[PDB]
Design a protein around this nucleic acid. Structure first.
Ligand SMILES: Cc1cn([C@H]2C[C@H](O)[C@@H](COP(=O)(O)OP(=O)(O)OP(=O)(O)O)O2)c(=O)[nH]c1=O
Ligand SMILES: [Mn+2]
Ligand code: NA
Ligand code: NA
Length: 327
DNA sequence: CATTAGA
DNA sequence: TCTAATG
């Protein structure tokens, strides 16, 4: 956690530059398991050798260790830190819709800067075009103060359209979070569940709504179950327009809301942990369900959940507020 | 790890 | 279809 930090931290720098800058999945996949192991290690690593005894720790990694050990630095790391080619790749990547694959091609062609990106707005696609569009606006965190405003509005149409609609803005904002990146709207409806061969207009209805009112300014991707877009709070009596924010919304088959809902709320740790528990408790919890465990090794038989409580009750746990899903 | 664009 | 990108 702290004792074997730089080491893991160095290793990730490394892996990262492999998977991104280079198409070296293995080496990349190498640095990580390593950076993972030394991470596990109950003692202050001292020599490459000592590290070396570890699964995943071969000579190559081990080597960097020492040099890093003696001189808190690394040439390979220092070099990667310099190299504009690589420097560049890491940056372009920031644009929503710009992956490595592209970060590199862009680079080759000579798409080094953002302005490059602009001049060649043509070499880009709508995603990455909106990505470039709200580059500033996107890198910014979503003040809860505004979270609540948004939250509200969204809720309002969801109802207006059809009252049978169920909306949950999940995520951090849900967990009391003073800030957030993008807003996470969970959706569902009655007519929609496990079997009932969809009703796509379901998702469709609302998006259409929020566009109507002008909440949702654009579309990143609109699927028959997943919407990914851009939104904005009505710029008040001028002088202070709002930042364009990232919004996501997904219809859920009511006979698997809460689980998802549970889940999408997290936190990352709470879930695992909680998830880890349902296990001792004869269960299994996944993004959608809560199944009873059978001794044959494994089992199915999807349990019926009417709220956060049920899932809990089931694995027989304490009701934990969103606020406390912290871990 | 499943969902969308795109080519 | 495959292959990228987001989450
Ligand atoms: C897991 C954690 C969340 O439930 C979900 C991913 O939601 P994310 O949008 O990835 O993030 P978050 O809500 O945890 O964080 P923040 O709002 O600060 O960006 O999967
Ligand atoms: Mn989020
Ligand atoms: Na070893
Ligand atoms: Na990106």
């Amino acid at each position: 956690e702290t004792l074997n930090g730089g080491i893991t931290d160095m290793l990730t720098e490394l892996a990262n530059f492999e998977k991104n800058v280079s198409q070296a999945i293995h080496k990349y996949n190498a640095y990580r398991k390593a950076a993972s192991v030394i991470a596990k290690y109950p003692h202050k690593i001292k020599s490459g050798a000592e590290a070396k005894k570890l699964p995943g720790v071969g000579t190559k990694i081990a080597e960097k260790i020492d040099e890093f050990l003696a001189t808190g630095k690394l040439r390979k790391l220092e070099k990667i830190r310099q190299d504009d080619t690589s420097s560049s790749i890491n940056f372009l990547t920031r644009v929503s819709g710009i992956g490595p694959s592209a970060a590199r091609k862009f680079v080759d062609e000579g798409i080094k800067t953002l302005e490059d990106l602009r001049k060649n707005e043509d070499k880009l696609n709508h995603h990455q075009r909106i990505g470039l569009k709200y580059f500033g606006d996107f890198e910014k965190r979503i003040p809860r103060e505004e979270m609540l405003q948004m939250q509200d509005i969204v809720l309002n149409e969801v109802k207006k359209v059809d009252s049978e609609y169920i909306a949950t803005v999940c995520g951090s904002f849900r967990r009391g979070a003073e800030s957030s990146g993008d807003m996470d709207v969970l959706l569902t409806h009655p007519s929609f569940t496990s079997e009932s061969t969809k009703q796509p207009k379901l998702l469709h209805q609302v998006v259409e709504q929020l566009q109507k009112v002008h909440f949702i300014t654009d579309t990143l991707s609109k699927g028959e179950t997943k919407f990914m877009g851009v939104c904005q709070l009505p710029s008040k009596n001028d002088e202070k327009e709002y930042p364009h924010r990232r919004i996501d919304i997904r219809l859920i088959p009511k006979d698997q809301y809460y689980c998802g809902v549970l889940y999408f709320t997290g936190s990352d740790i709470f879930n695992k942990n909680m998830r880890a528990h349902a296990l001792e408790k004869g269960f299994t919890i996944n993004e959608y369900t809560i199944r009873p465990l059978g001794v044959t090794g494994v089992a199915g038989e999807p349990l019926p959940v009417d709220s956060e409580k049920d899932i809990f009750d089931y694995i027989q746990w304490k009701y934990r507020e969103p606020k406390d899903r912290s871990e």
